[PDB]
Structure 1
């Protein structure tokens, strides 16, 4: 619908501070750096090319829209999630204890607060056991 396109246009305007119409590496670094998340410019610039359909070194509005429509269902992330919870399953039972989730969330990757892992256990620990199965959570992705 036109509502989502208008929201994407507003997002691009909030991104295109220079108004160039193609959010550039330095500009997209600035937009989120001011908020409070300050990733190194290397990650931003090397990510731009991964989504730059036309390969212009920036992101134009079509490249914004195409991914904005692209949800979790695409990009076959299912296999990546399977591997991701299989690596941390030292037993191979297909399930992982909640406390291990707390620890791995806290001490690896982009660290998040106890609130984030709290909502994580809320969603995943549907049966309230702690030993949450991987398959159910990954099904929740597409669902």
Structure 2
């Protein structure tokens, strides 16, 4: 699902129209472009299934970042692909721990913003300082300027 989402991410915008057409083929009557609890429940009941609205709202909250509680077009695509689960085992804990232990050049048991900057410069991918700030926020929950082992695991949780 997420892998399929990434694969389709290299396609045109009309695939969203195709997915809307398929959803209409299922449960025609949708007009707003947002799949709330009622629409997903109805389509699964037609299929012979019933997703829990708690899971649906959890998906809405996880996909939301600004706190809007709604879905944009790309957010609609992410919500649609969230109906299935494919990210299994989150790669491997031991390899992630080894990479984190390699990250600590000073061997202080923590990763600061400077080490993050050095690792990003080593990567060399097209990135901006805003992405660095977002990654630091997603990693440093307590905002102590360091990364704990538990906090590093949470930042790498569900990451392949």
Please classify the TM superposition score into its range, dividing by the shorter chain length.
Answer: 0.3 to 0.5
Give the number of the structure whose alpha-carbon radius of gyration is greater. 2
Give the TM-score taking structure 1 as reference length: 0.45
Larger relative contact order (CA 8 Å, sep ≥ 6) = 2
Q: Which has the higher strand share?
A: 1
